[PDB]
Design an enzyme around this catalytic site. Structure first.
Site, PDB file in Angstrom:
ATOM      1  N   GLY B  13       4.982  -6.399  -2.345  1.00  0.00           N
ATOM      2  CA  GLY B  13       6.320  -5.928  -2.736  1.00  0.00           C
ATOM      3  C   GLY B  13       7.354  -6.160  -1.657  1.00  0.00           C
ATOM      4  N   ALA B  14       7.434  -7.398  -1.189  1.00  0.00           N
ATOM      5  CA  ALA B  14       8.173  -7.696   0.037  1.00  0.00           C
ATOM      6  C   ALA B  14       9.520  -8.318  -0.220  1.00  0.00           C
ATOM      7  CB  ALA B  14       7.334  -8.601   0.943  1.00  0.00           C
ATOM      8  N   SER B  15       9.939  -8.419  -1.469  1.00  0.00           N
ATOM      9  CA  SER B  15      11.172  -9.161  -1.773  1.00  0.00           C
ATOM     10  C   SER B  15      12.411  -8.490  -1.278  1.00  0.00           C
ATOM     11  CB  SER B  15      11.340  -9.341  -3.273  1.00  0.00           C
ATOM     12  OG  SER B  15      10.285 -10.091  -3.767  1.00  0.00           O
ATOM     13  N   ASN B  91       2.679  -2.230   0.795  1.00  0.00           N
ATOM     14  CA  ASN B  91       3.985  -1.684   0.710  1.00  0.00           C
ATOM     15  C   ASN B  91       4.449  -1.489  -0.730  1.00  0.00           C
ATOM     16  OD1 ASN B  91       6.881  -1.291   1.735  1.00  0.00           O
ATOM     17  ND2 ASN B  91       7.039  -3.122   0.431  1.00  0.00           N
ATOM     18  N   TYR B 156       4.315  11.098  -7.382  1.00  0.00           N
ATOM     19  CA  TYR B 156       4.520  10.345  -6.122  1.00  0.00           C
ATOM     20  C   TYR B 156       3.731  10.927  -4.919  1.00  0.00           C
ATOM     21  CZ  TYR B 156       7.162   7.631  -2.664  1.00  0.00           C
ATOM     22  OH  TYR B 156       7.531   6.791  -1.648  1.00  0.00           O
ATOM     23  N   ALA B 158       1.114  12.840  -5.127  1.00  0.00           N
ATOM     24  CA  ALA B 158      -0.300  12.560  -5.434  1.00  0.00           C
ATOM     25  C   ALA B 158      -0.763  11.158  -4.951  1.00  0.00           C
ATOM     26  CB  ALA B 158      -0.557  12.703  -6.901  1.00  0.00           C
ATOM     27  N   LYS B 160       0.681   9.045  -2.782  1.00  0.00           N
ATOM     28  CA  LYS B 160       0.816   8.808  -1.371  1.00  0.00           C
ATOM     29  C   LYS B 160      -0.141   9.623  -0.554  1.00  0.00           C
ATOM     30  CE  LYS B 160       4.050   5.685  -1.468  1.00  0.00           C
ATOM     31  NZ  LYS B 160       3.726   4.229  -1.332  1.00  0.00           N
ATOM     32  N   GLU B 226      -5.382   6.616  11.350  1.00  0.00           N
ATOM     33  CA  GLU B 226      -4.267   7.478  11.759  1.00  0.00           C
ATOM     34  C   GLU B 226      -3.116   7.319  10.817  1.00  0.00           C
ATOM     35  OE1 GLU B 226      -2.915   9.900  13.087  1.00  0.00           O
ATOM     36  OE2 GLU B 226      -1.508   9.508  14.734  1.00  0.00           O
TER      37      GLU B 226
HETATM   38  N1  LIG Z   1      12.946   4.403   0.642  1.00  0.00           N
HETATM   39  C1  LIG Z   1      12.335   5.361   1.344  1.00  0.00           C
HETATM   40  O1  LIG Z   1      12.967   6.288   1.837  1.00  0.00           O
HETATM   41  C2  LIG Z   1      10.837   5.387   1.549  1.00  0.00           C
HETATM   42  C3  LIG Z   1      10.318   6.408   2.327  1.00  0.00           C
HETATM   43  C4  LIG Z   1       8.963   6.486   2.538  1.00  0.00           C
HETATM   44  C5  LIG Z   1       8.120   5.537   1.979  1.00  0.00           C
HETATM   45  N2  LIG Z   1       8.596   4.526   1.255  1.00  0.00           N
HETATM   46  C6  LIG Z   1       7.612   3.567   0.704  1.00  0.00           C
HETATM   47  O2  LIG Z   1       7.713   2.272   1.312  1.00  0.00           O
HETATM   48  C7  LIG Z   1       7.569   1.237   0.320  1.00  0.00           C
HETATM   49  C8  LIG Z   1       8.829   0.402   0.109  1.00  0.00           C
HETATM   50  O3  LIG Z   1       9.821   1.069  -0.682  1.00  0.00           O
HETATM   51  P1  LIG Z   1      11.392   0.682  -0.691  1.00  0.00           P
HETATM   52  O4  LIG Z   1      12.192   1.916  -0.320  1.00  0.00           O
HETATM   53  O5  LIG Z   1      11.671  -0.561   0.094  1.00  0.00           O
HETATM   54  O6  LIG Z   1      11.462   0.469  -2.317  1.00  0.00           O
HETATM   55  P2  LIG Z   1      12.103  -0.756  -3.196  1.00  0.00           P
HETATM   56  O7  LIG Z   1      12.170  -0.317  -4.678  1.00  0.00           O
HETATM   57  O8  LIG Z   1      13.350  -1.190  -2.458  1.00  0.00           O
HETATM   58  O9  LIG Z   1      11.080  -1.994  -2.992  1.00  0.00           O
HETATM   59  C9  LIG Z   1       9.707  -1.913  -3.346  1.00  0.00           C
HETATM   60  C10 LIG Z   1       9.233  -3.279  -3.812  1.00  0.00           C
HETATM   61  O10 LIG Z   1       7.850  -3.145  -4.200  1.00  0.00           O
HETATM   62  C11 LIG Z   1       7.789  -3.725  -5.486  1.00  0.00           C
HETATM   63  N3  LIG Z   1       6.659  -3.307  -6.321  1.00  0.00           N
HETATM   64  C12 LIG Z   1       6.405  -2.134  -6.964  1.00  0.00           C
HETATM   65  N4  LIG Z   1       5.235  -2.220  -7.641  1.00  0.00           N
HETATM   66  C13 LIG Z   1       4.762  -3.467  -7.432  1.00  0.00           C
HETATM   67  C14 LIG Z   1       3.594  -4.254  -7.851  1.00  0.00           C
HETATM   68  N5  LIG Z   1       2.662  -3.692  -8.656  1.00  0.00           N
HETATM   69  N6  LIG Z   1       3.480  -5.517  -7.385  1.00  0.00           N
HETATM   70  C15 LIG Z   1       4.396  -6.101  -6.577  1.00  0.00           C
HETATM   71  N7  LIG Z   1       5.505  -5.451  -6.161  1.00  0.00           N
HETATM   72  C16 LIG Z   1       5.713  -4.180  -6.571  1.00  0.00           C
HETATM   73  C17 LIG Z   1       9.131  -3.415  -6.166  1.00  0.00           C
HETATM   74  O11 LIG Z   1       9.402  -4.171  -7.350  1.00  0.00           O
HETATM   75  C18 LIG Z   1      10.042  -3.789  -5.021  1.00  0.00           C
HETATM   76  O12 LIG Z   1      10.263  -5.234  -5.038  1.00  0.00           O
HETATM   77  C19 LIG Z   1       7.142   1.968  -0.932  1.00  0.00           C
HETATM   78  O13 LIG Z   1       5.698   2.123  -0.923  1.00  0.00           O
HETATM   79  C20 LIG Z   1       7.815   3.318  -0.795  1.00  0.00           C
HETATM   80  O14 LIG Z   1       7.192   4.219  -1.705  1.00  0.00           O
HETATM   81  C21 LIG Z   1       9.940   4.436   1.013  1.00  0.00           C
HETATM   82  K   LIG Z   2       0.102  11.313  13.749  1.00  0.00           K
END
Ligand SMILES: NC(=O)c1ccc[n+]([C@@H]2O[C@H](COP(=O)([O-])OP(=O)(O)OC[C@H]3O[C@@H](n4cnc5c(N)ncnc54)[C@H](O)[C@@H]3O)[C@@H](O)[C@H]2O)c1
Ligand SMILES: [K+]
Ligand SMILES: NC(=O)c1ccc[n+]([C@@H]2O[C@H](COP(=O)([O-])OP(=O)(O)OC[C@H]3O[C@@H](n4cnc5c(N)ncnc54)[C@H](O)[C@@H]3O)[C@@H](O)[C@H]2O)c1
Ligand SMILES: NC(=O)c1ccc[n+]([C@@H]2O[C@H](COP(=O)([O-])OP(=O)(O)OC[C@H]3O[C@@H](n4cnc5c(N)ncnc54)[C@H](O)[C@@H]3O)[C@@H](O)[C@H]2O)c1
Ligand SMILES: NC(=O)c1ccc[n+]([C@@H]2O[C@H](COP(=O)([O-])OP(=O)(O)OC[C@H]3O[C@@H](n4cnc5c(N)ncnc54)[C@H](O)[C@@H]3O)[C@@H](O)[C@H]2O)c1
Ligand SMILES: [K+]
Lengths: 236, 236, 238, 234
Positions: B13-15, B91, B156, B158, B160, B226
């Site tokens: 999910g790196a786009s 991610n 969510y 659950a 994470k 960790e």
């Molecule tokens: N935004 C925040 O504050 C925050 C905080 C803590 C953790 N995170 C976590 O970090 C990660 C990144 O989130 P973000 O904020 O950049 O969200 P985002 O919506 O900007 O990007 C996430 C990307 O992952 C992709 N994705 C989802 N399911 C997928 C699948 N099955 N296959 C391929 N791609 C998929 C989405 O389409 C998107 O391109 C997530 O796991 C999120 O839950 C985000």
């Molecule tokens: K820690």
């Protein structure tokens, strides 16, 4: 390697073991390292010389980190030489292991004064000296024994658990002036137990030092009040 | 320039968002980055081009990280292209927030499948491809919501919290072959009750990405199982 | 013994092991216990009969806790008989241990559905039924494997770690209506000699010892405790 | 309401607040409670009298829990009256809140000595007196501030975080001889926006958690930290 906005660091109890590696690692990354020792200057000088041979910046400085006045004076000496201080590592620590039933109150105070009171003084002074520049990062070298406890270590676990908790409270106090406070909790480090360590070996001092370095560095800029485990999977 | 023994990384999910920064940061440190996307190739290609224009190594690769067969095939493609895979970042993640009383079982499954099942597949495959070469590091991008919970986020939290616990189990399974598994738990990231954040601002995606990088790097070589908090002091 | 404002409790997977002890313990403290089972009625009926013979209140009720519609119907049945429901224990759980590299996706789903999805459905329905009367307490039976992890248990640790975190979120949602949610994390329980060396109390825990912890978290004595995880592992994890 | 194999309990700093409720709660459950105080005997006597009027067993005993020799003597006095001691609660605690830059070393020591050193001495003596009979349970009253930290409380968080860790080490040492050690971490307790249950905790609610950890119901719980903070920290 790692990016540092700051220019220098004080490391308590840095003449040997983990303290020594922290000094090596940080010096190797362009920081001017202040190597603290209590009694034997030869060992500290040998480390300083070894670093200078490699082209790094290092000095030694004598003080007892449990002594308020000594610690204050030492910081003032550093401020005079370098103009300020960006980073502090509270690494000074002792052990006096006994079963609790055999342990005197003096045995307990000994370890509290050297391990926890030392760190309180360091963190307090870091706060005073770094607030001027509105920047800093401080690392408290705690221990797995502070998270988990251990037989024969009521006093040590107390001091390291107190260190971990205390560091969080400082993190709140340092936050608006952009001074970060974090802890490292190393497992068993070189200088049977191995059975229980998933990675199946003791940690090197270098591995602890590179974790301390990360927490000081700019890479950890949104990390404050955290405890970083460096124990090879022994505790998760 | 953090030190990496490994040569490449896959990032699910790196786009965009955090995933994109992880790719930028790791590419800037000499790793060849495999940018995963599901649907829109334009966005991923733009990122890949941006990185190549800077002289870095990058490719894009299409798959749904919740689909076992797609994920397996993608890894086989990378193994044939590069000869192996040293690093993985799970991610890929979604949210579907609602109060529990308004939440259907499908809402729960949606977030479990995309957040946790995705990570299980990744960690499993990382284990298969990296065990050959007896080296690897894997990071699971979790969240403060996994540690602490939150109103409206039963599903969510659950997924994470399950991710964080699951990662520990993998860490045991990867340890003897020197494959590390760790989690990052970001707080609120730019992408308020800033009131409650001690550092008094949201985190940047960079700041999360440099923590991921540390856990992948050689500097974290005694750190496995960790959970690294990147939340500005919001949870300690 | 322990004080309960509420009058009845549902316990998922209560026919045997820990679930059974929870039922015994709570019935012995004056609660009407609803004993959930999936397939074998003989075992559940035997436990119900045992409790009635002691003067306690008990019934049995058949459902699959991973099936939403079954769980909803079961709660409606209990509401019709007793007029409401004050307590719920999500105890239903399975294991399917394998090294991750030998584990199919269906092995993972199997454990998630039965251990975590089951609990989500229970906690959700508890919230619906208990919010009317502005009172309740719910306990999720998790595990040391959810806090700590374990080799061969990527799926189980995932489910129980998820259960722990999910419970906290429900605690926030239940709090204003005085519905508490808490987890228990048992260590190794009897219902060996490798494990025991590492356990400071030097023995496996009994099912009763886990059941009295559950009881405390349901009871009025734990009224300012919510979103907490109570370790019942003999010192194996601190 | 709860089952106890043991017959008596010592509670440090029990004249008032949370300590007082612990004494009430445990006396109401059939334990002989020893109410510790430092200075004002009036308040302790009044509590002891109140409990005796209700039919319960109670005594008062004067000592500074931070003083090793006082604490030892007190335990010897209890042992001569009752023949032993099954339960101990380290509740004695103080605060002296200041920003760290305004805090003297003596402000730090003050809180360490009264909060942590006091608990070490209690745990150590509990270990000595309970090992004879191979049974006991001990509770350390810690605090949310020990888990989480707080602005202005470098000294308090230090002392309670230390208490939490220390208790685990004692749990290892006591385990052989079937002596359990546990901590309670109360949130904000009465003499709110952020507290999910939306109110401060009562002293009674902390006291019933302590009781559970002392009781036979917690017999497979040792080295644990029990949060009593209404959801304020999870
Ligand atoms: N935004 C925040 O504050 C925050 C905080 C803590 C953790 N995170 C976590 O970090 C990660 C990144 O989130 P973000 O904020 O950049 O969200 P985002 O919506 O900007 O990007 C996430 C990307 O992952 C992709 N994705 C989802 N399911 C997928 C699948 N099955 N296959 C391929 N791609 C998929 C989405 O389409 C998107 O391109 C997530 O796991 C999120 O839950 C985000
Ligand atoms: K820690
Ligand atoms: N070695 C391990 O297994 C391990 C494990 C967990 C934590 N730690 C912690 O890491 C830190 C360093 O350990 P190490 O391997 O360097 O041990 P070490 O044997 O080198 O001892 C620590 C160092 O601190 C110094 N020191 C002690 N008290 C001091 C004081 N009051 N003032 C100035 N200096 C003082 C000593 O001179 C010594 O060099 C300590 O805080 C230790 O408790 C170590
Ligand atoms: N026994 C231990 O050592 C131990 C340790 C830690 C945690 N736990 C947890 O304790 C709880 C009870 O386990 P136990 O040891 O008594 O196991 P058990 O298998 O003896 O009992 C669990 C019962 O629930 C049933 N069950 C499973 N899925 C169900 C569903 N979807 N609906 C209804 N019933 C279902 C089982 O077949 C069984 O009757 C579980 O949640 C388990 O994960 C057990
Ligand atoms: N009030 C709260 O919200 C709260 C929250 C969490 C934890 N706690 C803890 O609960 C415990 C009881 O606190 P409280 O609210 O009843 O405080 P309190 O001040 O009302 O009473 C505490 C008692 O401890 C006694 N004491 C202190 N040092 C002593 C010593 N060295 N020897 C003997 N007695 C001593 C004091 O004289 C006092 O009577 C404390 O340890 C405190 O940290 C309180
Ligand atoms: K707990």
């Amino acid at each position: 390697a790692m990016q540092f906005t700051g220019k220098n660091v004080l490391i308590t109890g840095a003449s040997k073991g983990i303290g020594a590696e922290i000094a090596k690692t940080l010096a190797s990354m362009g920081l001017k390292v202040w190597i603290n020792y209590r009694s034997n200057a030869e060992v500290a000088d040998a480390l300083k010389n070894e670093l200078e041979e490699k082209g790094y910046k290092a000095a030694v400085i004598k003080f007892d980190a449990a002594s308020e006045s000594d610690f204050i004076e030492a910081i003032q000496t550093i401020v005079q030489s370098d103009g300020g201080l960006s980073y502090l590592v509270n690494n000074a620590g002792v052990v006096r292991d006994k079963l609790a039933i055999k342990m005197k109150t003096e045995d307990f105070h000994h370890v509290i004064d050297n391990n926890l009171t030392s760190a309180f003084i360091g963190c307090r002074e870091a706060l005073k000296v770094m607030s001027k520049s509105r920047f800093g990062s401080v690392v408290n070298v705690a221990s797995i024994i502070g998270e988990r406890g251990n037989m024969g270590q009521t006093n040590y676990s107390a001091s390291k658990g107190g260190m971990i908790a205390m560091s969080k409270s400082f993190a709140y106090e340092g936050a608006l002036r952009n001074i970060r406070f974090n802890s490292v909790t190393p497992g068993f480090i070189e200088t049977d137990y191995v059975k229980n360590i998933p990675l199946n070996r003791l940690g090197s001092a270098k591995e602890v030092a590179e974790a301390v370095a990360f927490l000081l560095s700019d890479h950890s800029s949104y990390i404050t009040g955290e405890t970083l485990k460096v124990n090879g999977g022994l505790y998760m």
